């Protein structure tokens, strides 16, 4: 929101009619450029805008919990359909199976080299390479506002217990790691589009 007093900190009053000028308020006094210039208006320079933005706008919108659970269930079901995954953009043309379930030994990984080796074995590293090659600079004023780079989304690794899988996988570009108990729709259907490539650990799949 703009400041509550931007455009009104000046003193200015309408000079009236009869002076061959618009009846808008003008700065009084003299000796400076600002003297005699209009004030207090959206159309005016250094004036206030029309309908200043306020912080008590509604930024958060409430959603029924049951509808949220409906959307999570739909997003999980879409992730199990191979055709939607290819549409969504994931390079899964040689993935051994969908849904992809991997052993519990992955939860105990400790190195990103082991995590990348796992991805290459299950042929899921094409999606990571897709993310790396898609990394770009943002278009527009976004990069002036701590939004420097953009890239595509890779696989989502779902685990049941943390033993090092988070730290092993968290540096691979595009890979998002999530606990099964707290699945997020912002990750399950990113951008509103269904069918994200999800790699489940065996314990997570059993707890589904």
């Amino acid at each position: 929101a703009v400041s509550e007093k931007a455009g009104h900190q000046t003193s200015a009053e309408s000079w009236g009619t009869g002076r061959a000028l618009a009846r808008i308020p003008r700065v009084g006094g003299g000796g400076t450029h600002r003297s005699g210039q209009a004030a207090f208006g959206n159309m005016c320079r250094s004036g206030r805008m029309f309908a200043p933005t306020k912080t008590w706008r509604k930024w958060h919108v409430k959603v029924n919990q049951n509808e949220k659970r409906y959307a999570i269930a739909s997003a999980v079901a879409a992730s199990g359909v191979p055709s939607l995954l290819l549409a969504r953009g994931h390079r899964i043309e040689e993935i051994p199976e969908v849904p992809l379930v991997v052993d519990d030994a992955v939860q105990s990984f400790q190195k990103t080299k082991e995590a990348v080796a796992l991805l290459k074995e299950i042929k899921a590293y094409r999606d990571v390479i897709k993310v790396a090659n898609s990394r770009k600079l943002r278009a527009g004023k976004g990069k002036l506002r701590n939004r420097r780079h953009v890239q595509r989304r890779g696989p989502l690794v779902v685990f049941n217990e943390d033993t090092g899988i988070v730290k092993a996988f968290r540096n691979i570009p595009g890979v998002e790691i999530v606990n099964v108990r707290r699945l997020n729709l912002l990750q399950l259907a990113p951008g509103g589009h269904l069918g994200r490539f999800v790699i489940w650990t065996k314990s997570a799949f059993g707890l589904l």
Binding site: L144, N146, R148, R170
Partner: protein, 125 residues
């Protein structure tokens, strides 16, 4: 990605810190890598530059040039290297500044404080 809440990921604040850094901070900002021989001998990846160090230009129009550091021009983030000059129109010679990260140190100016720095930073002298 950073996970500390005391470190700034703001492009604005990082650029202000770089360009408002005092002399004692620009000393560490202007660091240069060590050559293969010094790196394998001192077990140090890089050290801050210092006057009278014997360095080699790695990048730029003066790639491959050799010389000693005559003066670390900290306030402009530039290193002035001997024999690395440019000829003005009137015939005078103007030293050309080279960034610290674009050179490599091939011989240090070993003082006791520099020796303590080496052994402190997990190195061997």
């Amino acid at each position: 990605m950073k996970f500390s809440r005391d470190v700034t990921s703001s492009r604005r604040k990082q650029r202000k810190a770089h360009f408002g850094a005092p002399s004692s901070v620009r000393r560490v900002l202007m660091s240069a890598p060590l050559s293969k021989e010094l790196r394998e001998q001192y077990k140090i990846r890089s050290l801050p530059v210092r006057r009278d160090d014997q360095i080699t230009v790695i990048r730029g129009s003066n790639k491959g040039r050799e010389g000693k550091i005559t003066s670390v021009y900290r306030k402009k983030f530039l290193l002035l290297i001997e024999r690395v000059t440019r000829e003005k129109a009137n015939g005078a010679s103007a030293p050309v500044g080279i960034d610290a990260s674009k050179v490599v140190i091939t011989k240090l100016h070993l003082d006791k404080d520099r020796k303590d720095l080496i052994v402190r930073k997990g190195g061997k002298v």
